[PDB]
Amino acid sequence: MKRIGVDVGGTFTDLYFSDDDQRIAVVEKVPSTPHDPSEAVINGIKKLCEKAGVSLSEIDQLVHGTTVATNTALTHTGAEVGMITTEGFRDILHIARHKKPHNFSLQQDLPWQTKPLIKRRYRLTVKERITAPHGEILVPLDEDEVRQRVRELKTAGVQAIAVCLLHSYLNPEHEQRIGEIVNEEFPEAYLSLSSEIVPLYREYERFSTTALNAYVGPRVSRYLHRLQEQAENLGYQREILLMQSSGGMVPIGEAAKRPVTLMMSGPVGGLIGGMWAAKQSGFENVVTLDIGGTSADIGVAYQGELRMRHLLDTKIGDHQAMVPMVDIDTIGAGGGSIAYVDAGGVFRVGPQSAGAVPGPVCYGRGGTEPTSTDAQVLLGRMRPDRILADLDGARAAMQGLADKLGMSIEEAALGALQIQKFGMTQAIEQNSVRRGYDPRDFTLVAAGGAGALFACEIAAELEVPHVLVPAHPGIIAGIGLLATDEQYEFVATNRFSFASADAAVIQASYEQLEREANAQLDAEEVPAERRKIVWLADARYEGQGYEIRFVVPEGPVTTAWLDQAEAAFHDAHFEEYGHRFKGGTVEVINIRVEARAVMDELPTPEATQSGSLENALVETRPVTFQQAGKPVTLDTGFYDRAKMGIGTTFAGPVVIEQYDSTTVIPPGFTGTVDDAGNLVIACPAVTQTVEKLATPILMRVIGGALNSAAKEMASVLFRMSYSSIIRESEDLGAGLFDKDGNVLAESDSTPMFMGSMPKIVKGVISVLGDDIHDGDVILHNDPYLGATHSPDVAIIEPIFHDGELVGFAGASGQLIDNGGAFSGLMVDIQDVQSEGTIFRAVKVYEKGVRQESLIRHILNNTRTPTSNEGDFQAMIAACDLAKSRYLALVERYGRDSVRDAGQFWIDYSERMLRQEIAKIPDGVYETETGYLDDDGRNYGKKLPIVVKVIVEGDEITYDLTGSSEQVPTAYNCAFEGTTVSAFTFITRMMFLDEVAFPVFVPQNEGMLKPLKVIAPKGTIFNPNYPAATFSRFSQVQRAVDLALRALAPVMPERVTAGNSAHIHFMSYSGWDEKQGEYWVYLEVNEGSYGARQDSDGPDSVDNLIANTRNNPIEELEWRFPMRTDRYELREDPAAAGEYRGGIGIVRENTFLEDTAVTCEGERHDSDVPWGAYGGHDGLNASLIKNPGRDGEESWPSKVTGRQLQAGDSLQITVPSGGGFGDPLKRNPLQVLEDVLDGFTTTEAASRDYGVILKTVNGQLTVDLAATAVKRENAVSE
């Protein structure tokens, strides 16, 4: 009946108050206090109630939109957290998924390791185990140990404790018992059980959710309690509600128990508020757009409902989570984006941010670079007398951008805005075109900041005729608080497939969730005559690894209910990707119940006013628009919109100046003001005049579109794939090519497909020739015609327009099995024919007609036919999608324009790489001969690797003379595709780093040109046919690491010390009798990372050429017959230095059935990881069957098909890296942390580093008196 909503953004505080019978809406804002968030809400309420003259005791409900929990996790300003976890897994929050954020960087630090929420000194272990799938107790709980660990945590001074055991979502009795011990021994400690925060599987994501919860728990619990107790003293007798990131109210008590759901809340309110203003006029389909000061938030609401984001995309800053969130696209192109031409002569805006501190110099603030917002001033969209209420400070400041491009005086500003428009529009079209949305039906809605500026421009590109702006864009966040309804989410993990399902267990699971939902609603005193309950489910095809959420019908679960739910899955899949699989089984993973309580809908406030243009017309200043490309200045008036009434539909180019927003209407079109205060502008979609564009803009538009096509085809292929190597390792490549085969656009998904796609398409062109027709689909994997290695299979489709070949679209990924000599992986084999099936430009669809017999023959020759068929379908779908997006610009601009735009980016890439190679002094750079362990067929004999690097001019050559001859195993590297690809990748890493280098250079044909690799025929790096090249990874890893050691004397700042430069690529496989199928698990064990000159080396992460993700343990134990019994950091210290070398992991996998094991190992009995500038050397790996038990065997690095029976375990120990610099110059304040964490021992701290740590007052501290003495007498010895 009487409701208020308060939202706190970070500078301003917005308050909205509405009434049903009185029909009064009050708008009020109040300045916010950043140091104390409580003193901004209370004061706000005090200002709201006094103006209207109402009492707080009459409010039915109030909603709060704070963001304190976000700023605590982002700035890492929370509490000391302890962890009681299963013993042997003490390092899970350290490992993460072992994937770096960036694929092509060497100077990047992992945020979860560098600033961890639970430090390693406070992570403790308890001996017990609970096993899937039923939840039996394998190891009994010891009662003395748990109490001792709790008391240790209490003595240290731990404020919050996060209990995180494996499989606690299955049965939580161990965590419950631990909690009941904790509360009685440590009453004043925040406690979080992982089972009660998110009872779902995936242990890293669940423990990270729990650890974030426990990290921000003590802070926001205090803030919420203070807010509730202070509001009650004012007179508020009810309970306060809190807005979550999924859309929904939740009371204070439950909000203090799950703070993790409050983080990143407030962009969601904008989308819901936009839906509210859109449904007044009558449009159900909405596209909301908010351009703020730094970023742009985009939200697409089809028919008027929210869209939940993908699991992989759910992350708070850098840490993952499993909290439900609304899919909102954040784009860097906002108010703070700098416009510049780089050294390669290319126009780009962003992603470097200017900030609000410098500001535009025309307003009189002080700046030194051209900004996105300063471009709006030049054209006249923003008045130069708005904030205040030099003039040429903007025109003359862009001289360093205008004349340097060949632009006109006034057209420079237009370019900077059009580039942002297109960047946002292809972001939208990525998530609009494949979804199957007709843009004419939709409506664009603006928001606060600068949202209405790009409204008609973007709608023209999308072809959207309706543009709507709400009555007050500056409060849409507050209004969207009140539009949503109080709902509770209760979830469970309940894995079933529709093939073998029971309509009684499912009903009981949903009834359990319903029981707890009704019990939650009983405590809030809500009548039973208004409780609406909706059921949902997360499902996926069998073989995939991520789910889609969709609404299932109302209960009870009957026989027809199953059919309706299975149909709803296909409807929700088709709507997200745009493809329909021809087979496969659907399985539900998680179930959800939302118990909504619709109390009353928010009515539109109908108020009427009177006015005209003549009331507030102040003056007329010149304003510049785009007239068919040319800049023509024209007259423009200014007046406030708070003076006109309803039906004041007037024409003329005018600029509306509201207190919070701006609305500028294009000339020649009128804007209708409806009764509700909204405006509907008749924006043009199809017009009769062709406009002009400058040279810098046209290249970026087509290039960005080809780029977006590459990344869109990548995401479709990898999200829909059945293969785990394509899905988790991201071992794929995709992009668009021209007639000659030169790549124009590439997905950049993995370093393993660097420059290898052009070789694939050129290899196809050279074997087919003119035998290229329309509707053709081509398979290719030949490693002597450009492929990386046999298991990666590529699909190419010709592109035709009016019977003329214009290009190609291509996608490639690694299958699980290709029908080779061993399941999965292989080392000890004869030649290339032993590797499996080779495809040599085999065409899949002749003239568009599917050759059923050819598809069937291919699918009969693999051990995993269901997975392989799924991967073929996903690759064909991504190529179809890219062909569509290419023909779109062929029709839009022209065939010659598309060919020319593709040629421009090749020479941009080449120019940028050559400028960097030319700066290194010319010469010949050498190093020590590296060694590899035996080939595999004959143990003992080492294999040398010599890398010499020659630099002459703007060209670089890698000479591998002196490397070994061909070995008769698969332990060789393909020259074009692997050797050239790896040295192209290390060149890009060395000179074009993602972190240090300012701009991101796309992967085209121009990167492949400025380097050459000379490797004599008949070596391991350039073998003669028919040598097998299946196992290629470790050789090129060591080769590029030796290339780093060779160039270390001249380039220290862009290299690293001795990396592990290895892989332990494992294949565990067996035959499942019940399913009648092979089960294959392919594991990529991460290595470690040698130190750098400026920062230490991250432990436990995929190194150099690899950037894979691990499979979660709980998913593995549900899917395969195994049990990971240990996964942590190795015990011995790794390597000393000024910056420490990285530590490897020791993973102990035990097995429950007879399994076969193949390993691609390296660095067991051979050369140690090196160090630099006097840094120590790392350690070699090992492979031991049954550590500390009966049957220990010291396995070599590379094995092929060794058997394990049952109860056997493999202890895989991976190498540790080397250090960089002399250990005697390390910081004294850091070795203290290293000893307590367990990185290095106390006895070996005086020798290598030379720091004396003495125990004083119980605690260990660094003494600055005896440290300087020891450093003197440590050089001579």
Site residues (vs ligand DUC, CB under 6 A): 725, 729, 731, 752, 814, 1033, 1063, 1065, 1084, 1106, 1108
Nearer to ligand DUC, 587 or 782 (CB): 782
Which residue carries 């590797």 as its tokens?
Answer: 835
- Report the side by side order of strands in the sheet with 123-126: 123-126, 81-86, 160-164, 190-193
**Judged by CB under 5 A, does residue 486 bind Ca ion?**
no
| Residue range at the interface with its own copies (CB under 8 A); choices 2-10, 510-518, 812-820, 1029-1037 | 812-820
CA distances from 616 to 380, 419, 611, 641, 675 (A): 20, 35, 9, 9, 20
Strands 948-952 and 955-959: antiparallel
Choose, by CB under 8 A, the member of 206, 843, 1032, 1147 that binds its own copies. 843
Whole-angstrom Cα distance, residue 1194 to residue 301? 59
Nearest to 553 by CA among 541, 566, 570: 566
Using CB under 8 A as the binding rule, the residues of this chain from 125 to 164 that contact its own copies are none
Under the binding rule (CB under 8 A), the answer on residue 1201 touching its own copies is yes
Please state the φ and ψ torsions of residue 167, each to the nearest 5 degrees. Answer: 60, 35
Q: Is 1255 left (phi over 0), alpha (psi -120 to 50) or beta?
A: beta
Binding status of residue 851 toward its own copies by CB under 8 A: yes
Neighbours of 892 (CB within 10 A): 12
Of residues 418 and 1111, the one with the C-beta less far from ligand DUC: 1111
* Distance (Å) of CA 772 to CA 779, 796, 797, 940: 13, 11, 10, 51
Query: What residues contact 117, with CB distance under 8 A and at least 6 apart?
Result: 76, 78, 81, 93, 211, 212, 214, 215, 319
Q: Which of 94, 167, 863, 1130 forms a contact with its own copies (CB under 8 A)?
A: 863
Among the listed residues 615, 766, 861, 1242, the single contact to its own copies using CB under 8 A: 861
Find which of ligand DUC, its own copies, Ca ion, none residue 1065 binds, CB within 5 to 8 Å per kind: ligand DUC
- Shortest gap between Cβ of 756 and Ca ion (angstroms)? 10
Any residues with CB less than 8 A from the CB of 1261 and at least 6 apart, and which?
1232, 1253, 1254
The answer to whether residue 865 forms part of the interface with its own copies (CB under 8 A) is no
| Residue 839 is a binding residue for its own copies (CB under 8 A) | yes
Residue 750 or 1124: the one with the smaller Cβ distance to Ca ion is 750
Tell me, by CB under 8 A, how many residues bind its own copies: 29
Backbone angles phi, psi at 1064, to 5 degrees: -115, 85
Q: Which is nearer to its own copies, 856 or 1017 (CB)?
A: 856
Between 333 and 787, CB nearer to Ca ion: 787
Considering only 820, 936, 1006, 1112, the residue that binds its own copies (CB under 8 A) is 820
**766, interface contact from ligand DUC, its own copies, Ca ion, none, CB < 5-8 Å by kind:** none
Percentage helix, strand, coil for the chain under 3-state DSSP, each rounded to 5: 30, 25, 45
Q: Which is nearer to its own copies, 221 or 830 (CB)?
A: 830
Distance CA 1111, CA 97 (A): 8
Please identify, using beta-carbon distances, which residue of 48 and 752 lies nearer to ligand DUC.
752
Distance CA 79, CA 211 (A): 11
CB closest to ligand DUC, residue no: 729
Triad 489, 490, 494: Cα angle to 5° = 135
Closer residue to its own copies (CB): 893 or 1078: 1078
Backbone angles phi, psi at 364, to 5 degrees: 90, 50
Report if residue 842 touches its own copies, rule: CB under 8 A: yes
In this chain, which stretch among 351-359, 685-693, 821-829, 875-883 interacts with its own copies, using CB under 8 A? 821-829
β partners of residue 31: 12
- Site track 1097-1136 with its own copies (rule: CB under 8 A), x = hit: ----------------------------------------
On whether the CB atoms of residues 1047 and 1055 are closer than 8 A, the answer is yes
Using the minimum distance from each CB to ligand DUC, give the nearer residue, 1034 or 1211: 1034
* 630 token code pair: 């040319």
* Joined tokens for residue 864: 């995993």
- Give helix 476-483 / helix 267-281 axis angle, nearest 10°: 80
Query: Which residue type does 1139 have?
Result: Y
- Of 6-14, 409-417, 481-489, 842-850, which segment contacts its own copies by CB under 8 A? 842-850
Q: Which residue is nearest to Ca ion (CB)?
A: 814
- CB closer to Ca ion, 814 vs 1240: 814
What is the closest distance, in whole angstroms, from the C-beta atom of residue 117 to ligand DUC in the complex?
A: 29
Q: Pick the closer one to its own copies by CB: 426 or 1200.
A: 1200
Q: Quick check: 814 binds Ca ion (CB under 5 A)? A: yes
Distance, CA of 1029 to CA of 521 (rounded, Å): 64
Q: How far is the CB of 732 from Ca ion (least distance, A)?
A: 9
Q: Which does 1063 bind (CB under 5 to 8 A by kind): Ca ion, ligand DUC, its own copies, none?
A: ligand DUC
C-beta of 756 vs 1022, nearer to ligand DUC = 756
Residue 345 interacting with its own copies (CB under 8 A): no
Residue 1084 touches which of its own copies, ligand DUC, Ca ion, none (CB < 5 to 8 A by kind)? Answer: ligand DUC
Is there binding between residue 860 and its own copies (CB under 8 A)?
A: yes
Residue at 501: amino acid letter: A
**Residue 451 and residue 468: Cα distance in Å, rounded?**
11
**Do residues 487 and 63 touch, judged by C-beta distance below 8 A?**
no
Instruction: Kindly state the smallest distance separating residue 752's Cβ from ligand DUC, in Å.
Output: 6
Q: Which of 838, 1057, 1105, 1181 binds its own copies (CB under 8 A)?
A: 838
* Secondary structure of residue 1237 in the 3-state scheme: helix
User: How far apart, in whole angstroms, are the C-alpha atoms of residue 810 and residue 785?
Assistant: 15
Q: Which of 576/1102 has CB closer to Ca ion?
A: 1102
- Rounded to whole angstroms, how far apart are CA atoms 540 and 201? 15
Token pair listed for 776: 């053709």
Q: Which helix (H) or strand (E) holds 7?
A: strand 2-8
- Contact mark string toward its own copies, 1154..1193, x via CB under 8 A: --x-------------------------------------
Positions of chain breaks in the chain, given as the residue before each break (C to N > 2.5 Å): 389
792 binds Ca ion per the rule CB under 5 A: yes
Beta bridge partners of 3: 18, 61
862 binds its own copies (CB under 8 A): yes
Stretch that binds Ca ion, among 44-52, 577-585, 763-771, 787-795 (CB under 5 A): 787-795
Contact between 1091 and 1139 (Cβ < 8 Å): yes
Q: Which is nearer to its own copies, 652 or 1026 (CB)?
A: 1026
- Tokens for 220? 């926001």
Q: Which listed range, 106-114, 167-175, 327-335, 814-822, lies at the site for Ca ion (CB under 5 A)?
A: 814-822
- Pull the structure tokens for residue 833: 């024919």
Among 840, 911, 1119, 1185, binds its own copies (CB under 8 A): 840
In the region spanning residues 691 to 750, those forming contacts with Ca ion, defined by CB under 5 A, are 731
Nearest distance in Å: CB 376, ligand DUC: 47
Minimum separation from the CB atom of position 783 to ligand DUC (A):
12
Strands 160-164 and 81-86: parallel
Does residue 829 bind its own copies (CB under 8 A)?
yes
- Look up residue 377 and give its two tokens: 């001033």
| Sign of the alpha-carbon dihedral angle for 408, 409, 411, 416 | positive
Q: Does 833 bind its own copies (CB under 8 A)?
A: yes
Instruction: Select from Ca ion, its own copies, ligand DUC, none the partner in contact with residue 840, using the beta carbon and a kind-dependent cut-off of 5 to 8 Å.
Output: its own copies
Interface residue list for Ca ion (CB under 5 A): 731, 792, 814
Interface residue list for its own copies (CB under 8 A): 817, 819-823, 829-831, 833-834, 837-840, 842-843, 846, 851, 853-854, 856-857, 860-863, 1156, 1201
